[PDB]
Amino acid sequence: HLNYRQKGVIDVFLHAWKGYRKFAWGHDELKPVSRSFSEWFGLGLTLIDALDTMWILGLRKEFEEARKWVSKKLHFEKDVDVNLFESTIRILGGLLSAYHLSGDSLFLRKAEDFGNRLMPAFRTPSKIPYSDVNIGTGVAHPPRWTSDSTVAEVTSIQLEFRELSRLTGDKKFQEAVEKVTQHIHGLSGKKDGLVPMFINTHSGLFTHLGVFTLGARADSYYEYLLKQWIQGGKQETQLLEDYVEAIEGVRTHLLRHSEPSKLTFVGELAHGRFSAKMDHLVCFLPGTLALGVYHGLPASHMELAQELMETCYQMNRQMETGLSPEIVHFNLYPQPGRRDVEVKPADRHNLLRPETVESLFYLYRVTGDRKYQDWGWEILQSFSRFTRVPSGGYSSINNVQDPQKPEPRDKMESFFLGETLKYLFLLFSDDPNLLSLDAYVFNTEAHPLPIW
Numbered sequence: 001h002l003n004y005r006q007k008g009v010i011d012v013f014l015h016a017w018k019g020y021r022k023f024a025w026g027h028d029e030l031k032p033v034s035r036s037f038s039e040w041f042g043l044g045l046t047l048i049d050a051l052d053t054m055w056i057l058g059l060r061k062e063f064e065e066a067r068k069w070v071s072k073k074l075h076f077e078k079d080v081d082v083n084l085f086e087s088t089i090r091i092l093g094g095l096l097s098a099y100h101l102s103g104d105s106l107f108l109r110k111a112e113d114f115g116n117r118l119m120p121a122f123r124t125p126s127k128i129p130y131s132d133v134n135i136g137t138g139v140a141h142p143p144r145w146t147s148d149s150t151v152a153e154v155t156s157i158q159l160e161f162r163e164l165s166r167l168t169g170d171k172k173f174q175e176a177v178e179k180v181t182q183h184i185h186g187l188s189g190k191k192d193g194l195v196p197m198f199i200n201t202h203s204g205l206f207t208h209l210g211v212f213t214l215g216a217r218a219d220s221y222y223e224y225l226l227k228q229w230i231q232g233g234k235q236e237t238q239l240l241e242d243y244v245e246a247i248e249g250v251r252t253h254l255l256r257h258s259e260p261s262k263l264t265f266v267g268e269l270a271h272g273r274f275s276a277k278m279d280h281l282v283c284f285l286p287g288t289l290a291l292g293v294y295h296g297l298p299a300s301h302m303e304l305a306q307e308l309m310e311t312c313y314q315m316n317r318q319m320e321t322g323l324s325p326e327i328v329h330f331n332l333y334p335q336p337g338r339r340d341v342e343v344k345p346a347d348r349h350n351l352l353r354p355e356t357v358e359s360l361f362y363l364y365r366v367t368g369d370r371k372y373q374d375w376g377w378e379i380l381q382s383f384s385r386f387t388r389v390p391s392g393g394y395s396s397i398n399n400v401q402d403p404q405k406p407e408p409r410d411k412m413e414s415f416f417l418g419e420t421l422k423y424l425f426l427l428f429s430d431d432p433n434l435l436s437l438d439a440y441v442f443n444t445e446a447h448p449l450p451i452w
């Protein structure tokens with residue numbers, strides 16, 4: 001049943017996992033070069049993020065060992081501040097997917113415990129949640145570096161809280177996140193469906209007006225408009241309307257073409273001024289566009305999806321290591337001697353992020369064009385060649401443009417095993433019934449949830 005490239009993904013997962021087991025078991029993140037670990041939640045983050053990946057890959061003895069850790073060692077009462085968004089997409093989503101795939105009620109019981117501890121974040125005058133909540137003390141607060149919550153953060157928790165309410169029969173989770181969605185539906189200050197990056201919890205209004213990105217702090221707002229619509233059985237038309245409007249806004253304001261290859265890319269807008277800067281995070285968008293087309297969105301979305309998938313591929317393959325940097329810049333006009341994909345010296349790191357292989361999965365599932373599998377295999381071979389740590393694990397690197405000295409940062413992010421390897425395994429599968437597009441939607445940390 002497993003094909004050659006899938007066996008390759010499993011090889012990579014188990015080399016990653018033996019570093020995690022040997023040097024970071026029960027801890028949030030492996031630091032593979034130093035053979036140690038780091039904590040920021042203190043909640044076995046990498047383990048929880050990889051539960052469903054282990055199940056999907058057939059790694060059942062490993063899953064059972066991880067299940068025993070959740071049963072005995074996972075406890076939520078420590079005095080620790082957590083980011084509501086990261087907690088929700090990683091830990092709440094990871095537990096809910098582990099429940100659905102395994103059927104083991106332990107994961108749901110941990111999910112409900114955790115969900116309850118996140119609820120104080122929503123006690124704001126506007127009901128738009130605070131950014132941070134202490135799962136042990138019950139205090140929630142805004143960040144220190146800014147007074148506002150982040151738009152993607154308060155709009156990328158809905159799938160998880162909705163599903164938790166459906167499974168527990170406790171309406172408070174769904175009611176809290178749906179208030180956020182309805183309120184933002186009615187806010188002023190969008191540009192043709194494009195949202196600002198920040199939102200004030202006291203006034204409920206957008207801040208940082210006139211500055212529009214589809215990268216960090218805005219990207220998954222658009223992703224979850226579509227995915228919530230799919231999740232709820234395509235009856236919540238306001239979600240679809242705001243999604244359709246947003247894609248037209250992307251077309252009108254953010255799309256330009258590179259030189260020399262005329263690649264379609266998405267840039268940023270600040271107070272009317274275009275910037276040809278594209279986070280690797282924006283590479284979520286071709287996958288989301290294609291997912292929409294599978295579910296009835298117009299064919300123009302697939303035209304755009306295929307152009308952007310090619311661009312995102314080139315963001316990887318035009319680098320010396322074959323791995324995309326964190327941020328790329330594009331030239332609107334010809335520059336002698338330059339490739340399409342420019343990268344600032346400070347932006348040359350790769351943190352093993354999943355968004356290109358994320359989108360290849362959907363492009364393959366919807367089109368059947370096997371070149372998207374070939375491109376994913378190419379990217380995985382680059383990960384193997386430049387980020388592998390002999391003792392175990394894989395590391396973020398500081399320089400995708402120096403194949404002799406990529407400069408490991410000594411960290412394996414939980415989304416390498418939660419997302420990057422999961423999307424690759426699915427991309428290579430010969431089975432369209434494996435986590436079918438008709439039956440599940442993935443949350444923004446690649447944790448599948450059932451369509452209602």
Ligand SMILES: [La+3]
Pocket residue numbers: 220284444445
């Ligand atoms: La994501």
